[PDB]
């Protein structure tokens, strides 16, 4: 009778056909990833094709039920997720060009290579090789050749394509009733919801900008400290009141400062905590590593893992003769099939990875009580934040003691704590400016507020003002440097990495208040807290079923981002950094440049 009834029936039929076709794609995708053969490439491709053909048909059919007459918000959410099609609104000649641009940009990034003026035959690719330079080299000129060459040989080629990409993508969004491609991306944070739980796509910018405001004083002092320490490494090319040269930031773009740790380490004599040797000395194996991880979730009230997990997962490099993908991936193959592919080594890092990937599996397992289309994270930021709070608790010296990898008498020293919170800042706080500025530029190019004639002028103006970062060599509009990063050439939103981060620490602060933690948050383990796993599981249960505002409020008590958590994790370092930067300038000038 009513349209809502027809929709429910429509959805029920979709779910039965989709669950099996998705599952079959997962299964073929798994057999390629655990058995790299040409035969399983075809079957992975063919199975994902059938599913992709099915998903598109259903999206078009779903548009046939008008959302205005759908009173059930859960039905509405599922229809909404389905109804969004994308480039389908564009004319087919256009759509082929857009995928022609997209595939060209991606191949240029993957097959791009740069050659040293010295030895005009030693040309190097990004991975491996250039990426090594940009992460390990301490030579100003070596790193410059890499940074400029990448933005020269590859960035210049991508420039005309990117300008076409903007126009076509903007029309696609304008046709889909969005102002620009940026508004289109910012809908992933939209929520209609009930009362107080709505979120506007424009409101995302407000909340990204007020929160980044509050991160800025911490970033400034981390920035002043790194500049000082780098002044010792590169004295000829660093100015104590100026921005930092972009080719000296520890990777090709300066997205993480993690590899500046050797040069910025506060107390280099004090070594880092590494239980690798203990695990080897206690004859630990992949099986033990993942068993400890299951125990960690059991301790907080969560599910044991499934027998399928244990039987069906790749938790060790196969050997046999099978070529495998060894990048750590948690799955959800559908239908109660929950697996991890890790080529797990007996190292502290892979111990910590296991805890993160089983926090994926555990999110996966809780939201499977949900309709197929309402079975992901509340937004694109929630899933990796859940994994992250699991590496945070499990690397605390108190966990590592209790599970027997740190002696019961372990010396927690203030210096080793500070050396830790630095390495964390260089990764976690480092990126928060890089991230915001990339996405502001893209959002503002897409809105048309940045002319094509000024693109890479505002780019580098904005890196100066916001990120505190300066162009080694000057760059004109024969350049697309935004797009010498993967995510920008391969058409992926970036603010996820910023949003993850603020959520991460909001979640931890609230789970650690339910476990009634006394003291520094950086030292919290939620182990043995049944109350915390209730709050956690009250979110994870929901999936994309309720507004993301309500999912947060159920862990954290608040409907939005708050950086007060992040800042309290790092407040230890803030104080140290400020006293270590008292006879230093804190901040940057937008004017100095290494070249003029």
């Amino acid at each position: 009778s009513t349209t809502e009834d027809l929709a429910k029936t429509f959805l029920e039929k979709f779910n039965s056909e989709a669950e099996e076709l998705s599952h079959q794609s997962s299964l073929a995708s798994w057999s390629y990833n655990t058995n790299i053969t040409d035969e399983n490439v075809q079957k992975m491709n063919e199975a994902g094709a059938r599913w992709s053909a099915f998903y598109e048909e259903q999206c078009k059919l779903a548009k046939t039920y008008p959302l205005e007459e759908i009173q059930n918000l859960t039905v509405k959410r599922q229809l909404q997720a389905l109804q969004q099609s994308g480039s389908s609104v564009l004319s087919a000649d256009k759509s082929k060009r857009l995928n022609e641009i997209l595939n060209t940009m991606s191949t240029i990034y993957s097959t791009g290579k740069v050659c040293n003026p010295s030895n005009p035959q030693e040309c190097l690719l990004l991975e491996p090789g250039l990426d090594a330079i940009m992460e390990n080299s301490k030579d100003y000129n070596q790193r410059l050749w890499a940074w400029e060459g990448w933005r020269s040989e590859v960035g210049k080629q991508l420039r005309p394509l990117y300008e076409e990409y903007v126009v076509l993508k903007n029309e696609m969004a304008r046709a889909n009733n969005y102002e620009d491609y940026g508004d289109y991306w910012r809908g992933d944070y939209e929520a209609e919801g009930p009362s107080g739980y709505d979120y506007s796509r424009d409101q995302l910018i407000e909340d990204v900008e007020r929160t980044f405001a509050e991160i800025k004083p911490l970033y400034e002092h981390l920035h002043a400290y790194v500049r000082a320490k780098l002044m010792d490494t590169y004295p000829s090319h660093i100015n104590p009141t100026g921005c930092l040269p972009a080719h000296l930031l520890g990777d090709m773009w300066g997205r993480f400062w993690t590899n500046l740790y050797s040069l910025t380490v506060p107390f280099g004599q004090k070594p880092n905590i590494d239980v690798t040797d203990a695990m080897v000395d206690q004859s630990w194996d992949a099986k033990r590593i993942f068993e400890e991880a299951e125990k960690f979730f059991v301790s907080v009230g969560l599910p044991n893992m499934t027998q399928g997990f244990w039987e069906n997962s790749m938790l060790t490099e196969p050997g046999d003769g099978r070529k495998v993908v060894c990048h750590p991936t948690a799955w959800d193959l559908g239908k109660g099939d929950f697996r991890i592919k890790m080529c797990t080594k007996v190292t502290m890092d892979d111990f910590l990875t296991a805890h993160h990937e089983m926090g994926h599996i555990q999110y996966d397992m809780a939201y499977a009580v949900q309709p197929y289309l309402l079975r992901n994270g509340a937004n694109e930021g929630f899933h990796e934040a859940v994994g992250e709070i699991m590496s945070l608790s499990a690397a605390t010296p108190n966990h590592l003691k209790a599970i027997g990898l740190l002696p019961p008498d372990f010396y927690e020293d203030s210096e080793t704590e500070i050396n830790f919170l630095l390495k964390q800042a260089l990764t976690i706080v480092g990126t928060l400016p890089f991230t915001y500025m990339l996405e502001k530029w893209r959002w503002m190019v897409f809105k048309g507020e940045i002319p094509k004639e000024e693109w890479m002028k505002k780019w580098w103006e904005m890196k100066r003002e916001i990120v505190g970062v300066v162009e080694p060599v000057p760059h004109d509009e024969t350049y697309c440097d935004p797009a010498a990063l993967f995510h920008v050439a391969n058409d992926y939103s970036f603010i996820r990495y910023y949003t993850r981060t603020i959520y991460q620490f909001q979640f931890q602060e609230a789970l650690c208040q339910t476990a009634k933690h006394e003291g520094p948050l950086h030292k919290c383990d939620i182990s043995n807290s049944t109350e915390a796993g209730q709050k956690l599981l009250q979110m994870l249960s929901l999936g994309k079923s309720e507004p993301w505002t309500l999912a947060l409020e159920r862990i954290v008590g608040v409907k939005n981002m708050d950086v007060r958590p992040l800042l309290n994790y790092f407040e230890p370092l803030f104080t140290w950094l400020k006293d270590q930067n008292k006879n230093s300038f804190v901040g940057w000038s937008t004017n100095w440049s290494p070249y003029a």
Binding site: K13, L27, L61
Partner: protein, 195 residues
């Protein structure tokens, strides 16, 4: 003259739930010990019948309805339950007197690449009456538009296939089920226990 329960529980082939199979156990002596002893059964719930007192008693008829569903659906085979299976495949009355027995079939009824031979009814205009059976293939007309037998927009084939792959989770795994209905009234008792 034993009652042939091994023909129901130890059958090589089981049925789809929409075409559930019924066997009459009548005029015979019953060995209930086989049922209660076996620990293979992951579900053994009785409503109205005390499993032990059955040896003492006699019922005119014992019906043995067998089908295959998935594990998270086994709960639906019980009085008062709702769901696709209860509503559209196999209904038990609210005054049901008998026992429900189930077990995991993944060793037999699952196949690499999947076994799509067991089916279930996804849509139906009305809920099944207690112990009703619907084997019709008529196209489900959800909207006001007639389907004309072709299937299309708001017009669906009413039966969908379970897919059973050995790697599925227990709630998505095949479960062979047996429902024993015990009838103690309005006919001359013919199925007796050993007592």
């Amino acid at each position: 003259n034993l009652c042939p329960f091994g023909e129901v529980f130890n059958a090589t082939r089981f049925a789809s739930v929409y075409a559930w199979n019924r066997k009459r156990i009548s005029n015979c002596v019953a060995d209930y010990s086989v049922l209660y002893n076996s620990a293979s059964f992951s579900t053994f719930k009785c409503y109205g019948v005390s499993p032990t007192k059955l040896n003492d008693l006699c019922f005119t008829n014992v019906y043995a309805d067998s089908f295959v569903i998935r594990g998270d659906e086994v709960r639906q085979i019980a009085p008062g339950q709702t769901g696709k299976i209860a509503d559209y495949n196999y209904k038990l009355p609210d005054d049901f007197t008998g026992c429900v027995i189930a077990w995991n079939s993944n060793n037999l009824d699952s196949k690499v690449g999947g076994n799509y031979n067991y089916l279930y009814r996804l849509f139906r205009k009305s809920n099944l009456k207690p112990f009703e059976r619907d084997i019709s293939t008529e196209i489900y007309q959800a909207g006001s538009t007639p389907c004309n037998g072709v299937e299309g927009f708001n017009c669906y084939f009413p039966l969908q296939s379970y897919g059973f792959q050995p790697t599925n989770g227990v709630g998505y795994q095949p479960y062979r089920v047996v429902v024993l209905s015990f009838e103690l009234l309005h006919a001359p008792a013919t199925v007796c226990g050993p007592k």
